[PDB]
């Protein structure tokens, strides 16, 4: 693509510089170029990829929600007609969001997932797949909303099944995946009980495994377990 002429290593290096510069769109494009080199990503690179897009899409999601709330307010009784702009601009932000999600999903489908044989990679990419369908679900309102949700669900489920089989319950990817899948349940699938059961069980199974960990692994896991607890506290 645009990054076709840059060395894979240089893209990765630049992705890391963009991350330092908080230039996440650039980071994302560098990482996309790196993915598109066709080589599997190392753990670090997969996290670079994830960080880049999460940040890009997180800005678009936060924007979309701002615009969505504005738009919902203009749709209330007594709201003064302001014309199409709010909807137009929400749609613009939404479209751009969908296109980032489509791009990530496209990187996962071509060909990250199919080449990812290790649990850490495969779960990670499936989680990412769940996450980006989830972001699509967040803005979905059409005939495809159920299928988008189902795709998020199916990706998360396959990631959960592998993570459960192949990773310790404290594995940060397993924990992050469960955290997000729990959020998917709560806020996308209208299954707050499942969301809560998932976060509870995940937290408790991780708790029971902490003893196996070095101090640094302990810190990685407990960091994520705390996010599970924050949700549980929020949700209960």
């Amino acid at each position: 693509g645009a990054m076709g002429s840059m060395e894979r290593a240089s893209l990765i290096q630049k992705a890391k510089l963009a991350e330092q510069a908080e230039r996440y769109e650039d980071m994302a494009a560098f990482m996309k170029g790196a993915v598109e080199k066709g080589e599997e990503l190392s753990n670090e690179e997969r996290n670079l990829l994830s960080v880049a897009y999460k940040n890009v899409v997180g800005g678009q999601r936060a924007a979309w929600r701002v615009l969505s709330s504005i738009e919902q307010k203009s749709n209330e009784e007594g709201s003064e007609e302001k014309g199409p702009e709010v909807r137009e601009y929400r749609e613009k932000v939404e479209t751009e969001l969908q296109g980032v999600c489509d791009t990530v999903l496209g990187l996962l489908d071509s060909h990250l997932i199919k080449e990812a044989g290790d649990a850490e990679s495969r779960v990670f990419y499936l989680k990412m797949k769940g996450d980006y369908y989830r972001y699509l679900a967040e803005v979905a309102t059409g005939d495809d909303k159920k299928r988008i949700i189902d795709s998020a669900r199916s990706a998360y489920q396959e990631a959960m099944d592998i993570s459960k089989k192949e990773m310790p319950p404290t594995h940060p990817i397993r924990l992050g995946l469960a955290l997000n899948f729990s959020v998917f349940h709560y806020e996308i699938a209208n299954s707050p009980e499942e969301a809560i059961s998932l976060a509870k069980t995940t937290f408790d199974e991780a708790m029971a495994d902490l003893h196996t960990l070095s101090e640094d692994s302990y810190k990685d896991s407990t960091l994520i377990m705390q996010l599970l607890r924050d949700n549980l506290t929020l949700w209960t």
């Binding site: 996450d131 992050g176 955290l179 997000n180 959020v183 709560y186 806020e187 994520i224 996010l227 599970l228 924050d230 949700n231 929020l234 949700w235």
Partner: peptide, 6 residues
């Protein structure tokens, strides 16, 4: 306040 995802 916003639920966490990672």
């Amino acid at each position: 306040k916003r639920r966490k995802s990672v």
